[PDB]
Amino acid sequence: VQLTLFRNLDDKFYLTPRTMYQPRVATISDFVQIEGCDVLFVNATVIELPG
Amino acid sequence: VQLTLFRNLDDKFYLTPRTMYQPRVATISDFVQIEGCDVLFVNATVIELPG
Ligand SMILES: *[C@@H]1O[C@H](CO)[C@@H](O[C@@H]2O[C@H](CO)[C@@H](O)[C@H](O)[C@H]2NC(C)=O)[C@H](O)[C@H]1NC(C)=O
Ligand SMILES: *[C@@H]1O[C@H](CO)[C@@H](O)[C@H](O)[C@H]1NC(C)=O
Numbered sequence: 001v002q003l004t005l006f007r008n009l010d011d012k013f014y015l016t017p018r019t020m021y022q023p024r025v026a027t028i029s030d031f032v033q034i035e036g037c038d039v040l041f042v043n044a045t046v047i048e049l050p051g
Numbered sequence: 052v053q054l055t056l057f058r059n060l061d062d063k064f065y066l067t068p069r070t071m072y073q074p075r076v077a078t079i080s081d082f083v084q085i086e087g088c089d090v091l092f093v094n095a096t097v098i099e100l101p102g
Contacts, residue, residue, distance in 0.1 A: 029078075029080040032075050033075075033076060034075065
């Protein structure tokens with residue numbers, strides 16, 4: 001919960017801390033899969049998902 | 052070590068915090084592999100291991 005998720009120009013997902021701006025490439029081990037969604041989530045397909 | 056491991060009704064492994072009951076599915080990235088076993092470990096086969 002200490003990381004922020006954003007998107008670069010090429011629409012790749014990146015993570016950064018909030019203490020300093022040190023962006024890194026988001027991988028599949030950085031996420032937890034849950035049943036429901038949210039209205040504030042970003043919509044993406046399996047093609048654009050993190051590797 | 053802040054998470055508790057348990058089994059759901061379909062014999063699938065789940066992890067939850069001990070501050071609130073917020074269960075989530077356990078993945079292989081959540082585990083550390085060691086040589087030995089204790090007597091209080093659940094017996095399982097490679098087939099029924101977390102995805
Ligand atoms: C997990 O399986 C192991 C392997 O069978 C069990 O260890 C055996 O325990 C019995 C008593 O229940 C002993 O008589 C055997 O000698 C043990 N075998 C070995 C190879 O150590 C273990 O008890 C099982 N654990 C659980 C929680 O069911
Ligand atoms: C995602 O799609 C849903 C419908 O499935 C829509 O209501 C929502 O506004 C979309 N969200 C974004 C961020 O585009």
